Amino acid sequence: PRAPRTYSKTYSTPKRPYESARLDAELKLAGEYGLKNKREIYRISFQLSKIRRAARDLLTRDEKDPKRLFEGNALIRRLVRIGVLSEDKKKLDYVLALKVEDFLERRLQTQVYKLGLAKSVHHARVLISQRHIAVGKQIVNIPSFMVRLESEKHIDFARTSPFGGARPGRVARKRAAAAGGE
Amino acid sequence: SDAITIRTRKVISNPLLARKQFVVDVLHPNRANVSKDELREKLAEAYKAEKDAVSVFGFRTQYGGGKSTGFGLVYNSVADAKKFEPAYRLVRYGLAEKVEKASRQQRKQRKNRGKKIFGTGKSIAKKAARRNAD
Amino acid sequence: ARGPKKHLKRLAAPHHWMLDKLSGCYAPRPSAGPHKLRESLPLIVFLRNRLKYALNGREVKAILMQRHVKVDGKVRTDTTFPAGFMDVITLEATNENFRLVYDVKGRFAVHRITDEEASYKLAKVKKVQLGKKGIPYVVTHDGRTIRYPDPNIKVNDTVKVDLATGTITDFIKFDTGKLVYVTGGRNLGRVGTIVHRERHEGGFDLVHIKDSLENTFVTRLNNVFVIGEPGRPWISLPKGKGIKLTISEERDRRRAQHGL
RNA sequence: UUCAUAAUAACUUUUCGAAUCGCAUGGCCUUGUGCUGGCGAUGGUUCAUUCAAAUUUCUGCCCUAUCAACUUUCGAUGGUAGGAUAGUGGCCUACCAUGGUUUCAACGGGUAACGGGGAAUAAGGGUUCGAUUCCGGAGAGGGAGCCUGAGAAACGGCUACCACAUCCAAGGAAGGCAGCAGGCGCGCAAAUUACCCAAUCCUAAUUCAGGGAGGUAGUGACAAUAAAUAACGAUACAGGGCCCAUUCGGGUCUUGUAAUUGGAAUGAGUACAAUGUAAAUACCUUAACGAGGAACAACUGGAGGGCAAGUCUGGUGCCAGCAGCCG
RNA sequence: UAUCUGGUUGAUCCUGCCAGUAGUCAUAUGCUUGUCUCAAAGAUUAAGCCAUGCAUGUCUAAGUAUAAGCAAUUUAUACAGUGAAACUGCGAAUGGCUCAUUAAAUCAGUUAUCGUUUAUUUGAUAGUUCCUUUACUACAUGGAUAUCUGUGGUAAUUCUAGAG
Ligand SMILES: [Mg+2]
Ligand SMILES: [Mg+2]
Ligand SMILES: [Mg+2]
Ligand SMILES: [Mg+2]
Ligand SMILES: [Mg+2]
Ligand SMILES: [Mg+2]
Ligand SMILES: [Mg+2]
Ligand SMILES: [Mg+2]
Ligand SMILES: [Mg+2]
Ligand SMILES: [Mg+2]
Ligand SMILES: [Mg+2]
Ligand SMILES: [Mg+2]
Ligand SMILES: [Mg+2]
Ligand SMILES: [Mg+2]
Ligand SMILES: [Mg+2]
Ligand SMILES: [Mg+2]
Ligand SMILES: [Mg+2]
Ligand SMILES: [Mg+2]
Ligand SMILES: [Mg+2]
Ligand SMILES: [Mg+2]
Ligand SMILES: [Mg+2]
Ligand SMILES: [Mg+2]
Ligand SMILES: [Mg+2]
Ligand SMILES: [Mg+2]
Ligand SMILES: [Mg+2]
Ligand SMILES: [Mg+2]
Ligand SMILES: [Mg+2]
Ligand SMILES: [Mg+2]
Ligand SMILES: [Mg+2]
Ligand SMILES: [Mg+2]
Ligand SMILES: [Mg+2]
Ligand SMILES: [Mg+2]
Ligand SMILES: [Mg+2]
């Protein structure tokens, strides 16, 4: 018998499964950011809910209370480091005002789309999935990645990738070989 | 443009084992892993030591290729490496030989068979032979 | 269980050895020795984990066998020796000397300490009795039985064993206004001065302790170890001197002292 | 404290107080095998310390009154002395007292009840579960009994009975998987007679030996994490912001639909290697291959309402069937 | 992570339940199933029964060596090297598995042992063993005993009787 390491769920399906307005909003968010499933929105909503439970619990506590100070400013510094909470509103009362779209916006998918190296959101998704974008010389094949403020300046195609400068790849190499042979 | 470059981080001397421990950080673009023997040689002429008193293991080429990381040790003498390292590393490096061991199941079978007999089996063998003689 | 227990599962090990909950089913059970296993520290843990001089069990065994470890001036070639609080670990290679004192987080921190003072050790008096033929003797916390002590040495006191002959060199009398260390509970590693010692007729003496930062707490007397006079500790206190900075103060220390 | 300890008188079918091993074998000269002499290893009485072990104080347990009185001649409550205990103790015996618990639920019955740390669930209060990764307890087919030891009422230790069985030359002998594998049975319900001491440790005279403890692999859609199944052009069929509105209409500005059509990228797979590992898989990296219907083809349920999506086509006609409910 | 909806009626407002809904480190099962990490897993009924194979033996320079075992060479007149077997010593009472019994029982928190045993580990610890000392082995006291050499018995078992 060895000590277990704790697996844990990271999403929560909603209570009403067939809400028309909610379903349309979920499809809008999936199509805006190229989300594969609707489990992605559930995961972001669950992260927002955990952050929000912490925020409300800290709000309930009295002002100028060591728990309030320590954990509140820890949460704010973590969120501004992520980039979802702007530096203007580091107050722990605007932290309740974050929306799911805010965390959606900081995904490596949307960041690659913003930088312009991917001209389409689905293009960003595939380019990430093909091991092309590297966040600071480290290839990331993972669309979400929660890109942080301090490292967004270091997104570019990887050196091993043809875009960053390397051998082209299977299709182009085979066509070059065929052209050289004939 | 191969230029396999090597680094030894967190190096600590240790005359308790007459060794020098470090983590091997090897940067190698446009190339696969570093084929331990070659990097053992690299550390050998890096630290002014023979290729026998140098050991590397626990390597891990990080995600996306390029950098790789392992653990490495440099012993003061080849004899100390012989007398302090595990047998399997001495087998990997060719400085020792795999011991001719029977498999575990057969060893346990023979252990029980020896259990069956009290004392040496020299007497019982001839006793049984002359027993089935008549 | 019918008889003694000789296995210590990894999760059941004290959270001050603070091993990895993975990479192993069991933990080093300290053999019988000078210290309680809940309070002690096995040599394998001190070398493989705290010092990283070794890598695993075989390396620790090879280190201990060739007589490079010297616990309180003695070799102690067994892997799970309970090297406890205030013991001295000497390695002639690297000529290094350690004294085990809790860092204020409450853990057996690596304390590199000088050779000159490493000649001696300090100890708490746990009993003062009269053995056969009328010979007085004193039992310390290590279990050391020192024969023929000073006639006015009492229980809960502290003493300075020379660790070479193993006799009585000097001692400090327990009383108010005296520098003191804590050896258990929430106040692990804390160092202060005894302000008051409420008697509590019937058991479980308590003492109030005020440290240099002028913070105050209270601890059981079993849990207390006089270490010297204020401003003049008899040993070399570890880094931080056990002030127990607040978590916010620790964060401020991380922010201020910071260079990369 | 009658404690530690000391002292006197005595007592013992008189315990211990080194007839034991390794290395180095120095110094004194009483120059001989003479005198002494270091570092250890095993022992060894007692007292401590540690690993503990036994008991032990207060409080806390699920349902049930279609269980209201329960216990004591056979210990039930207490007293004293003795026996036994390692030791307190009706723990047992001898003689006495007649006591102890109970509507604040005793006693009895049930538990498809091992207790707990905890799990699910979540406004707050709670409800249900907890056989199982840690701590305790109990058990080795059901029962009793015991040797050895410091520690067992041990069961991969013995003795006997009961139940179940095995080889048998019919005289006898040997049994204990609720250990790791695996088999029969049971049931809706649960894995390979695999590798190895690499890692965690543990045992021993003790590095070296051993360890189905354990780790590694095999099966594994129990659960849990991230996430492929296409992406972008150039063309034809179109739609919206339009310069106005001679009908136009360029499409002036963009967004889709077409078995048209191009160039790219990439794994899922194979596979030189090397890393990985005790040795191997597998993962990370990576040669060489590996996408056009990119057939490398995603299902599981549903389309009256609850509840997102058809009053389209054919079939059957209160049949077949569907329907958690209304139908 | 403070939410409700369909159904009694010609129609309404209720009480009320049925049903819907979302879980579930709650399993079973059906249909599908490409990847990486991770991992439960004969508990529920049967603590029912088990073939077979393993799951505990251990030697350091340092208890015992005359294996008629190996090495016989640079270290060898008792012995030294290596070392089976056996005696000795120690563990086998740890670990692993299961939840059958058990409802002030276990267990949890908190106490007590001035009410006791404790191999081991660690620290200390003893002149007297003379008994009338003006006759003793202390430069070392005695006998067995395994291993082994040989004879058997039984159909067989970790069965062992006789002799040296
Ligand atoms: Mg056990
Ligand atoms: Mg007394
Ligand atoms: Mg009595
Ligand atoms: Mg039961
Ligand atoms: Mg349980
Ligand atoms: Mg329960
Ligand atoms: Mg059960
Ligand atoms: Mg248990
Ligand atoms: Mg038992
Ligand atoms: Mg059974
Ligand atoms: Mg014993
Ligand atoms: Mg039994
Ligand atoms: Mg068994
Ligand atoms: Mg057992
Ligand atoms: Mg037996
Ligand atoms: Mg089994
Ligand atoms: Mg197992
Ligand atoms: Mg199953
Ligand atoms: Mg499989
Ligand atoms: Mg497919
Ligand atoms: Mg369908
Ligand atoms: Mg249907
Ligand atoms: Mg239909
Ligand atoms: Mg609808
Ligand atoms: Mg409610
Ligand atoms: Mg009605
Ligand atoms: Mg109606
Ligand atoms: Mg319902
Ligand atoms: Mg792959
Ligand atoms: Mg079962
Ligand atoms: Mg033996
Ligand atoms: Mg030998
Ligand atoms: Mg009952």
mmCIF file of C-alpha atoms in Angstrom, chain A residues 15-89:
data_model
loop_
_atom_site.group_PDB
_atom_site.id
_atom_site.type_symbol
_atom_site.label_atom_id
_atom_site.label_comp_id
_atom_site.label_asym_id
_atom_site.label_seq_id
_atom_site.Cartn_x
_atom_site.Cartn_y
_atom_site.Cartn_z
ATOM 1 C CA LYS A 15 -28.163 21.829 -13.231
ATOM 2 C CA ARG A 16 -30.567 22.645 -16.077
ATOM 3 C CA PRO A 17 -29.108 20.779 -19.080
ATOM 4 C CA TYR A 18 -31.452 22.203 -21.755
ATOM 5 C CA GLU A 19 -31.576 25.948 -21.123
ATOM 6 C CA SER A 20 -32.012 27.577 -24.530
ATOM 7 C CA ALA A 21 -30.322 30.900 -23.742
ATOM 8 C CA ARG A 22 -27.512 29.149 -21.866
ATOM 9 C CA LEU A 23 -26.993 26.678 -24.724
ATOM 10 C CA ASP A 24 -26.868 29.504 -27.272
ATOM 11 C CA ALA A 25 -24.366 31.430 -25.138
ATOM 12 C CA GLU A 26 -22.210 28.313 -24.772
ATOM 13 C CA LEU A 27 -22.247 27.778 -28.538
ATOM 14 C CA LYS A 28 -21.370 31.454 -29.056
ATOM 15 C CA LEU A 29 -18.368 31.113 -26.745
ATOM 16 C CA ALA A 30 -17.324 27.814 -28.351
ATOM 17 C CA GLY A 31 -17.417 29.307 -31.844
ATOM 18 C CA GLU A 32 -15.746 32.580 -30.878
ATOM 19 C CA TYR A 33 -12.694 30.830 -29.403
ATOM 20 C CA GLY A 34 -12.716 27.502 -31.261
ATOM 21 C CA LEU A 35 -13.403 25.373 -28.195
ATOM 22 C CA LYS A 36 -13.567 21.677 -29.044
ATOM 23 C CA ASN A 37 -16.358 20.783 -26.599
ATOM 24 C CA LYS A 38 -18.609 22.555 -24.133
ATOM 25 C CA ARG A 39 -16.636 20.942 -21.306
ATOM 26 C CA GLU A 40 -14.148 23.772 -21.814
ATOM 27 C CA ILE A 41 -16.701 26.403 -20.782
ATOM 28 C CA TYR A 42 -17.670 24.195 -17.839
ATOM 29 C CA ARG A 43 -14.016 24.045 -16.770
ATOM 30 C CA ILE A 44 -13.545 27.818 -17.009
ATOM 31 C CA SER A 45 -16.797 28.370 -15.108
ATOM 32 C CA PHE A 46 -15.589 25.941 -12.426
ATOM 33 C CA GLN A 47 -12.273 27.789 -12.109
ATOM 34 C CA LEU A 48 -14.178 31.075 -11.878
ATOM 35 C CA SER A 49 -16.442 29.566 -9.213
ATOM 36 C CA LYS A 50 -13.499 28.359 -7.106
ATOM 37 C CA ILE A 51 -11.835 31.772 -7.367
ATOM 38 C CA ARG A 52 -15.175 33.352 -6.527
ATOM 39 C CA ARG A 53 -15.865 31.168 -3.493
ATOM 40 C CA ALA A 54 -12.442 32.147 -2.176
ATOM 41 C CA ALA A 55 -13.135 35.816 -2.942
ATOM 42 C CA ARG A 56 -16.519 35.851 -1.194
ATOM 43 C CA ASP A 57 -15.159 33.954 1.814
ATOM 44 C CA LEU A 58 -12.377 36.532 2.161
ATOM 45 C CA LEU A 59 -14.911 39.353 1.711
ATOM 46 C CA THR A 60 -17.016 37.993 4.579
ATOM 47 C CA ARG A 61 -14.004 38.326 6.886
ATOM 48 C CA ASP A 62 -13.349 41.660 8.575
ATOM 49 C CA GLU A 63 -11.222 44.311 6.885
ATOM 50 C CA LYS A 64 -7.588 44.474 8.041
ATOM 51 C CA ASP A 65 -7.583 40.831 9.169
ATOM 52 C CA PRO A 66 -4.368 38.807 8.547
ATOM 53 C CA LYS A 67 -6.258 36.118 6.622
ATOM 54 C CA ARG A 68 -7.948 38.779 4.494
ATOM 55 C CA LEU A 69 -4.678 40.555 3.712
ATOM 56 C CA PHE A 70 -2.506 37.511 3.049
ATOM 57 C CA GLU A 71 -4.863 35.364 0.982
ATOM 58 C CA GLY A 72 -6.612 38.285 -0.742
ATOM 59 C CA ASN A 73 -3.447 39.913 -2.046
ATOM 60 C CA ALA A 74 -2.107 36.454 -2.907
ATOM 61 C CA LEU A 75 -5.170 35.795 -5.074
ATOM 62 C CA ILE A 76 -4.993 39.250 -6.676
ATOM 63 C CA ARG A 77 -1.288 38.929 -7.467
ATOM 64 C CA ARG A 78 -1.909 35.482 -8.967
ATOM 65 C CA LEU A 79 -4.759 36.767 -11.138
ATOM 66 C CA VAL A 80 -2.884 39.853 -12.359
ATOM 67 C CA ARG A 81 0.085 37.575 -13.063
ATOM 68 C CA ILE A 82 -2.279 35.452 -15.155
ATOM 69 C CA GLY A 83 -3.470 38.695 -16.774
ATOM 70 C CA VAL A 84 -7.247 38.295 -16.518
ATOM 71 C CA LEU A 85 -7.546 41.021 -13.858
ATOM 72 C CA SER A 86 -6.211 44.375 -15.027
ATOM 73 C CA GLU A 87 -3.814 46.291 -12.788
ATOM 74 C CA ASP A 88 -6.435 49.049 -12.457
ATOM 75 C CA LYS A 89 -8.779 46.905 -10.358
#
